[PDB]
Amino acid sequence: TVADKQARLMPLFKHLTALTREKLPLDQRDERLKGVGILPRGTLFSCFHARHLAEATELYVALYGAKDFNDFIHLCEQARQIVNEGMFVYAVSVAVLHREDCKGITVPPIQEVFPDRFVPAETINRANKEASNHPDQQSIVVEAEETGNILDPEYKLSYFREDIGINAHHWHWHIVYPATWNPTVMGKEKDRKGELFFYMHQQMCARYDSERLSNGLQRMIPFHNFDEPLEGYAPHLTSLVSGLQYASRPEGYSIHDLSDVDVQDMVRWRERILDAINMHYIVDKDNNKIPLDIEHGTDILGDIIESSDESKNVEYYGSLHNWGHVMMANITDPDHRFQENPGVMSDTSTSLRDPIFYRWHRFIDNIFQEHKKSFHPYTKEELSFPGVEVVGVSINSKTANVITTLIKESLLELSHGINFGTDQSVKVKYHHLDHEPFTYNIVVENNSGAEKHSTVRIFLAPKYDELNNKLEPDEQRRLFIELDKFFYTLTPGKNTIVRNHQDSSVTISKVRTFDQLGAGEGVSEDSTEYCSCGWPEHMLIPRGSHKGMEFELFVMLTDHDEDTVAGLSENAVCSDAVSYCGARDDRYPDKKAMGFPFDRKIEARTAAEFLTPNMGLTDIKIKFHG
Amino acid sequence: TVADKQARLMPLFKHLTALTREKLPLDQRDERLKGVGILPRGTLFSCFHARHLAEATELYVALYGAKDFNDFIHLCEQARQIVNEGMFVYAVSVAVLHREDCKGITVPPIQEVFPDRFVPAETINRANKEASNHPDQQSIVVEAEETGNILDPEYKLSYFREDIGINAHHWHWHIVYPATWNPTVMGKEKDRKGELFFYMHQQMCARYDSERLSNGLQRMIPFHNFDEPLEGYAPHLTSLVSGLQYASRPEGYSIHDLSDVDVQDMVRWRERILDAINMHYIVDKDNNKIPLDIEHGTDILGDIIESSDESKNVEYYGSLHNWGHVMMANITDPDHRFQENPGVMSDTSTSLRDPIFYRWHRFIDNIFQEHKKSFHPYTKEELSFPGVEVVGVSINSKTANVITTLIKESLLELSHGINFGTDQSVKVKYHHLDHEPFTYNIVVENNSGAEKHSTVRIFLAPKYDELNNKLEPDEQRRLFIELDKFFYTLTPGKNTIVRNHQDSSVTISKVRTFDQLGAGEGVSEDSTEYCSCGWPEHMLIPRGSHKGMEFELFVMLTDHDEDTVAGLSENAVCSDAVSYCGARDDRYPDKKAMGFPFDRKIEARTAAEFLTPNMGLTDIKIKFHG
Amino acid sequence: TVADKQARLMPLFKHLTALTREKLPLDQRDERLKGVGILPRGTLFSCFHARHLAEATELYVALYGAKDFNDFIHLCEQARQIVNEGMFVYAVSVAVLHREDCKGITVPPIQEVFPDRFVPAETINRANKEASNHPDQQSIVVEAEETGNILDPEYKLSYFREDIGINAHHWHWHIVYPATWNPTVMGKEKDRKGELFFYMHQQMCARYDSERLSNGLQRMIPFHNFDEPLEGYAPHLTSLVSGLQYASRPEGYSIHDLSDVDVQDMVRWRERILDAINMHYIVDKDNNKIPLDIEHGTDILGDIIESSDESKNVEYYGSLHNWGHVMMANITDPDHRFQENPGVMSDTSTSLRDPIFYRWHRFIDNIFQEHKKSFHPYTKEELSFPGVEVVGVSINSKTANVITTLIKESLLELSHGINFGTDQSVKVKYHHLDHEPFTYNIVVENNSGAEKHSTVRIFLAPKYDELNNKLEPDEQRRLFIELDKFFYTLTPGKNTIVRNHQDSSVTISKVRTFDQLGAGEGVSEDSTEYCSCGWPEHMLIPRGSHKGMEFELFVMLTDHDEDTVAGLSENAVCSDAVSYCGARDDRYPDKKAMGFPFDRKIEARTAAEFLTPNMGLTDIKIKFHG
């Protein structure tokens, strides 16, 4: 049964670190690999680096190739013995997500699988220590929160950057859309992966910026200049695999050439993207030019920038984004003479924690923005949905139009990830931001005679700037974060549409723990995205401040008939986030450009001026509770 | 497989009539149909009448609603027993075309399903007679051509009007774009259906006019005045399903009110429409005004005129086109006291045969024309594609620049449609117009440095008028028929583009027979046009005359980058026939107004004066072979 | 899904009577049947008659042949239109039971499908009348119990004979083991069907006899002599299909020749079976002799006697059992000049109600008994399980060692079976025998060192004869009824095994109503046997008397290792009765002859003398509550 299948998968995931000791007593046995097998076990796996990705792709293909599920388990079991463990988790998760046979199946928790990435070394040490200190079945609980002098104001952001859910999501997203993805081999293609790459990262930056403003900090600045020295960050993460840890970075470091590729190369590739934009056309390998067409243009750029296998030219264009992660990651030892491990930037699970991440991503986002700039703005025609008027919006909470945010304690179970020994469970306690539940009530007047179908789009943007209160829509575009997108039908006359925050399309409703999965539930059975992907729920709104920071609440209704050609496939099944995740093996359900109406330049000085009749702005307050 | 699915659907439709006998003892049993259960089995189904359309729509929805294909077959199986058969074929065909379970399921050929509509009564009852006369497995062949005194010159046109392919196409087209189509229910919308409605019918008229001229007859005149008496036409079609036949109409009696509608109302609807066109806006139900925009205007008008469900106002504007068919159809018994069946005008399969069809359609076309008139003409800017020059065009055939047309015999197999009994097959032999294959060679000079992409548009228009030789482009607009539209890439320097007639975008390459289908065919797993629509191939060019009538051959090249739309749709699907049919589940592939450059008024006295550098006219001859 | 599949099946079953009106307007259409199609719709279908069975078999094969489930539904839907309805239900049920595709699926209730067979004409008339009398949504309830003078003491037995559950079971059993069953065609074979045929019928007789004794009536006598006149029985059943009903029989009728086969033929076949027994060997068609081997011998006899398709010789041996039903059924009109319907004997659903059934079945049982007689008795060796001793047995109820039996009212919903019209539901109230729940506690001493596995067999036999109290084991063999058979493991030392009556292997735990089935439960999804087959639970013990009739309670433990070679396949899934039903697509799980230890002759004068150490008898009382 499916349940049995789930059980088999969980053990593929257990004791990965330990699973090593290849113990296939003749090297010749795998003639299948006679000139490959290159990255050893203990080594850190880089999600960004090309060579690592190539190996990973090779692994996935074998998994995809597996004739049946049983065969799948077998090769996996065997492969896991030899290959580097990180690569293995990566390859398997991709396989589980896509391979039909796996119509059954969650992947074990990333946080749970590698607890060391989620929690600090101190807590991990303590738990391990307590386990040894007194042998006893009794459970161990450790509170990760610590006590320290907080020198850097960046620390304030830690609730966002360090959040377990956020890191997990980032890991999962890359799994759903792998850079290595080869559509020919799989046969299936990932719709608009390049564009999604752009959108997801942009949102992370946008959301990040809202945190800084909530904090009273200015917006992050892009890492435009390669020459500038980076700010330092020390992760305090250990790798349980070994004694080694992610190397910390002090500040004052400009970016160094690596043996692999060099800063100059980064520049070239940047000059190179720009030409293609200016010339309205990119050079394929064939030396043909492809136009940066209206719908297409973001997607093509996304593939080139990341870059994915899909890039029209890898050799002229390179892989700017990925190399950025690699270069930043080994700033400490570009030479690798030190034989030190890379920083957090190397891994999709960890990278969000470093503040540098935002600087780089804003830089890349800028590239996309220049492209967007080339496009013409939106006419009333494009925006408006005639006959429909938005009367008002209200948010209901304990206090209307105010959302309250607080910190909540939570526990993570280490036992699946690290050797438990005698103890039944070792849990680490951490705290994260959370908010009260709320609902939206939108009153819409349907002037038309017949029932209409509308897509409701809701975004949140900060009211205040760093100078004073200024709702300049051009700037707002960067800041706006997507709360929700959903379909509703309106009858003629007045209508009130109520939606609850819980329903939000952006967030993952729930991630099942390896324990829940040990039994067998019925969200349904799809895969790596299942409970994993989606933005985390606690994260839905920015922290705000004790004072109650003012944010613009924007609701827009668009013609659904227009919006969805097709693409209302799987219902509330395993995964549940379309806004950032897309839909399983079906289209991202919306014709509009991701981020619409915000994606193109706004002529108006004030946001209010921008509004059409089917748009509305309600100012609400977010107040944090200490 | 999908082909096994074929083999079941075809015997579902095979012999419709005898699958009636509802045979469900309690009427209440099918609560599923408690809303309908109004039009009995034997009665003729009207494609035009509103009430009939409503029932049909209700049926389709159930079919669309069907959860899965198996469920689809079940409801269909049982529904067919109770509903009128004509309605049933209509509803099912629509379902097959749209519903995703059905790709690669062609329908049973209409001609084959209802042979009686395609062939004359004499060859229906002769064939039936032969079957009874001598029982024997042996095949029966009957030649439909007959022998008779040919009093009316209209008879000459019969090759065009009576053509099997033409009638079939008309049936199919209405299926792809149903008047009843409700986008909300389906969720998907038919792009530019109103405009397509206009374009397709206009082409039929235009093509018809070319036949008359080839014949030496004057162009058809519109049925502007409701008062005028109609010319008579006797179809000689029987409906085997019953004894009944389509009632013939003699000439010479003015128009009669039906219980359903009065002629005065028809006149009203016209003055209503004309006014709107005039003041440049139409009134919605909401009593808001929508402008007749250049982009939108034809589409909005098409919906109102037909009228479709899409019409912005049904209760003010009415349904002029459809009522026209109904009124003409029951001219013989407006009262229906006679209880006589309607004429050919009632059915999409038959309507083209009656000469009245053209008179009415020209009338409606006129309505569209007035709208077109309001639009400004095309500047050199719009027409020209700079840097591209058309040097010359040549048509290659047995004799260059001459196309030969002849009559070819063909056979139609009755057996699927009517009860065969003992005989293996009963075929009726008919003759149709056909032409020799030919190719076009266009020499184009690409002045630009880079490769360009062009859409080649080819049209044919008669050189001679009724008076004498006069290439007055204004008049030509009505006459021009579309030969082909395709994309080609031009390198710098001289280029020669060759295209074969077979490739023509206007025509259907092949219609598979029941026999072909039982054998089976295969495509991707989605839902599409059921190997259907597209103009018949033999029909591609007008008959011409033995003398070799002169026609202007017009070729124009336009910038493809401008012409195409960007978006993400399917694999190679039913796109052969894009010019008249559109593309399956796709937006119309050409930005230009349908019929461009011909749609707007032409200032010049002569066509030659109109030409820009990217246009060319070659005079060719069409000669018929007796 | 399975649920959807269930839904499709239920409608195959609805309005069967009505489903007629073939309405396939040309007879030639089904060339597949061009020389068959012989029994009209309205006619009564005989489960026994050979010609009817042949048609039924032909139908099933088509259903089995169906490529997929969807195809299955289609042919079924179409076939049901033409074929006689009774045959149809029979063929479909068989298909549902065996055909894998139907890994989904209960069959709609027999009682519910044909309520008229279960309830008396009066009640059915009343319900129908009430429906018409006052139209109203309101529910109708009718109490079937009636009021009448009860002339015949046979009436007392009516609770047993008339029981709804019993009749339903009999219907289902024949479906699981069809006489027509051809193993070559299906490919699969029904293990020991001939023997099971013998065992099931024998049990019905045995159980019947216990009722008579409980009643104070003597045991039924076999219908040995063909000459003797039969006792009359009037069923009072109507067939809703038509106005006709099962013809009643008065007494005083000796059995008449029918056109089909004659009494003399019955005798021949009887003389013929006997020879084969005496000669130790039966004549196959090949004229080879097959020995009436130890294990095999009952099975071979069963096939010949019934007779099934499996019979080694149909033409020498005939089909005695089946013809008996036919002959008795049309005693009233052997000639069929009267054109009267057959009696209850014709149908598996109805036959148990007639008292004649027992007389005939005892006669046939006698045939089997003679065969059993030829076998040698059981030695201590065969019976005993050494090292195991049964200390005692106790039955726990309200009062220990006493079981209480009462009458319970129940309602049956007619609506699925007969045209409901306006009413939501029409229920008929009936009463049936029922008993208090009880448990058994068996103390067993396991002398051996190791754990043993035992099969516990429990039987019940009447203590009293018609003369006075005499536990003569030879006679008891006929009377003993099987309460339960189950596997238990015994450790060394004393053990107490407790089993509840509810668990009984003989009975069906629950039959799901068409209403329950309208939703979707998880007993699992197997088929006609699902809730249907198994003996009914209320029926588990005989009525007993108010005085508290004494019955011997016999418990025996046997070596399980010995007992099951293989055959512990499907668990508590859809069907749940192994003792009488066998297991789905797996062996009847017991090596021992069915009815062991009772099947062979017992030398001893008293039952007690028979007991070995692993056997025990506890006398309990059954007392009925008025």
UniProtKB/Swiss-Prot annotation, chains A, B, C:
A cellular-component GO term for this protein: extracellular region
SUPFAM superfamilies cross-referenced by the UniProt entry: Di-copper centre-containing domain (SSF48056), E set domains (SSF81296), Hemocyanin, N-terminal domain (SSF48050)
Subcellular location: Secreted, Extracellular space
Tissue: Hemolymph.
PROSITE patterns listed in its UniProt record: HEMOCYANIN_1, HEMOCYANIN_2, TYROSINASE_2
Molecular functions per Gene Ontology: chloride ion binding; copper ion binding; oxidoreductase activity; oxygen carrier activity
Keywords: Copper, Disulfide bond, Metal-binding, Oxygen transport, Phosphoprotein, Secreted, Transport
The keyword Secreted is assigned to this record: yes
InterPro entries: Di-copper_centre_dom_sf, Hemocyanin/hexamerin, Hemocyanin/hexamerin_mid_dom, Hemocyanin_C, Hemocyanin_C_sf, Hemocyanin_N, Hemocyanin_N_sf, Ig_E-set
Protein family (similarity comment): Belongs to the tyrosinase family. Hemocyanin subfamily.
Quaternary data: Scorpion hemocyanin is a 24-chain polymer with 8 different chains identified, assembled in hexameric substructures.
Annotated function: Hemocyanins are copper-containing oxygen carriers occurring freely dissolved in the hemolymph of many mollusks and arthropods.
Extra facts: The two copper ions bound each have 3 nitrogen ligands (presumably contributed by His residues) and share a bridging ligand (possibly contributed by a Tyr residue) in addition to binding oxygen.
Name used for this protein in its record: Hemocyanin AA6 chain
Protein's organism: Androctonus australis (Sahara scorpion)
